[PDB]
Each structure stands twice: as structure tokens, then as C-alpha cells.
Amino acid sequence: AALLPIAKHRESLLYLVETNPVTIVVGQTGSGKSTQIPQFLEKAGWCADGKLIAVTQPRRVAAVTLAIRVAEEFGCEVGKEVGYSIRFEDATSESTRIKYMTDGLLIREALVDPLLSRYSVIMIDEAHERSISSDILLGLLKKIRRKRPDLRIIISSATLQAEDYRAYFEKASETQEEDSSNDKQKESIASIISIEGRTYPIDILYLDTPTEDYLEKAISTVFDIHTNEPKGDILVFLTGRDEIEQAVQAVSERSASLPPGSEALLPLPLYSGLSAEQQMYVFEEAPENTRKVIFSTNLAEASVTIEGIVYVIDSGFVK
RNA sequence: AGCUCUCUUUGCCUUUUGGCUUAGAUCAAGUGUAGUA
């Protein structure tokens, strides 16, 4: 946990969240923002007054997995110190301080608490995913922050459009223009803090011509990169369930015709409505003299992180 | 060198195709999905 770049800038983000009303953090998923920032604010002592910290997530399985991960890292049980709430599932308690909430459920709790007086800082992680409820939380937190400046707001930005986020925090309102008569300096209500990540160098390869049928060149790319390059788990991002079904059937039929004595290929699908067995098959690592070829839809992006993956083929289409 | 029973081979066909014409004429077919939880 100490090797994450979020630990090196912990004092800077603590200062910016204690001083500025809103601070926008820029960093990609995997640098430890969502895993350590609630831990950093808890260790700073933002829950000593019985006040809570909340993390507003767009995805549900991602919320559950990050809840159990941070509960394991913190050494605490789920729901008694670090808890979560997804739709019709509220693992929370009075002693719980760190909250991983569905943003839609914080709409439904904004039907309960008007000023959000039960929470100290509200943060929107991976805000460029841009759910509807995240944006309407942004609007209502802007209104409440005009109404109550005591609470704090953190926004996690993937890239430069945080500046546009920054734009959303200079145009506050129009009633303040009547009171804008003094020559005081415009205080930095919104600030930006840099926490980078760490990724290995990745080679990008394109095509000289536009592809004809991305399924057939996807599987032919899979078999060519299996034959040529050394061991590494091949992953492809396809679009929809019938496409992954056709891909796994095609790679199974071609692996039936592969010459013996080489590395075998294990076809694996990744969907949203998977059962426990094949999902665990994807999660468990490749056997001896076997290379996993995993065809995935939009789960391996941010929702569920799979490890030991070297190759990735982009179909260029998302539903 | 018989008579019974058993088995094999030979014989047997024993439920063993009951008219006609322009082969009498004509003959494609419901739907199969599933970014995200």
C-alpha cells in the first residue's frame, strides 16, 4: 500500500480537502485513489465527530468488490467500520465510518437528509464514466455547497476535462453578482491535485487497412499472436454475447486442429450474467502448458479487474 | 442297417408387394435476443 503514488501526495490532498471546499483529483483507475483516499481521510480523523465519508459509485459489482478489498486492507469486517449500499442491499451500521454508496441511493437519501449533514466529504470516483446520477449529484452538491460550505467535495477525473469540471466551479450563481462589489481576490474554491499512476510500457499496433470482419481478424490475430509471441494471457474486448459465443466456438474448433506439442489454448468467456463456475474459471490462473484466451465484454474495463493479462485486442465497438 | 431325442445340410416360401393415366398432379418460409448489475 505504501508503494502507491496516492501515499506520496497524501498530505497535499489532505491540505486541499481541509482548506478548499472542492478539490478535483486527476488519476486513472488502479493508482489507489478509491482504496486509500477514504483510508487517508479516516486516519486524518474526519470521523472523530461521528461524521461520515462517502464514495459514490456508478457500478454495483465494482462497489461490492472495492468494499471487500478496502475491508480486507483495513483489517475490519464489512459493514461495521467500512460498509456499502447498493440497490436494496445496505450493509451499513452506526459504527460504520467509511461508506461506499450508490449515487442513486444518495438521491434517495437526499429525499431523507436535505443538507447532507451526516457526511463530511462526498467524492465521485471515476467521474468521467458519467452516470446520470453522478451529474445530478454534482448539481445538488453545488447547490448545497452554496448553501453549506462546511462539507467537502472531491472529484476523480481521468483526464483533462477536469478543467471543464473546474469551469463548473467558477460559474457559481447569478445572485452573487449583486453582492460582487468589493475588490477582493476570487478565492480558489476549486483546486486540482496530481496523483499519477504506474503502468508498464505498452506497444500499440494498428492496421494498414480497415478491417473487414472484426470477429475473424480478432480470432486470427489471437492465433497468430499465440504462435509467434511467447507466453502471455490473451484478452480480447468483443461487443455482445453472441459475438463472444461465436468467438469461443471458432477458437475451440481451430484449437482442435492445432498441431500437438505446442501450448494449448483455453477459451473463456466473460459476461455480465455469468454463474460462479466459469467466472471462477476465468479468475483462476492458466494451467501448465496452457494459455488462456479470454473474450470479454465491458466488464474488464473498470468493473472487475483480472490479473496476469498481457494481450488485449480492441474490436473498436462498444454497445 | 432298429426305434426315440438332439444337431447339421438339402427340399420347401408356407403373413412372401392385388389395376389404371399427364412418374395421375403439385409442394419456399414464423420470430432466437441478451453495454452495464
UniProtKB/TrEMBL annotation:
KW Nucleotide-binding (keyword) present: yes
Domain Helicase ATP-binding as annotated: residue spans: 14-178
Presence of the UniProt keyword Nucleotide-binding in the record: yes
Keywords tagged on the record: ATP-binding, Helicase, Hydrolase, Nucleotide-binding
Gene Ontology cellular component annotations, sorted alphabetically: catalytic step 2 spliceosome
GO molecular function annotations of the record: ATP binding; hydrolase activity; RNA binding; RNA helicase activity
Highest taxon of the lineage: Eukaryota
Domain Helicase C-terminal: 201-319
Name by which UniProt lists this protein: RNA helicase
Organism: Chaetomium thermophilum (strain DSM 1495 / CBS 144.50 / IMI 039719) (Thermochaetoides thermophila)
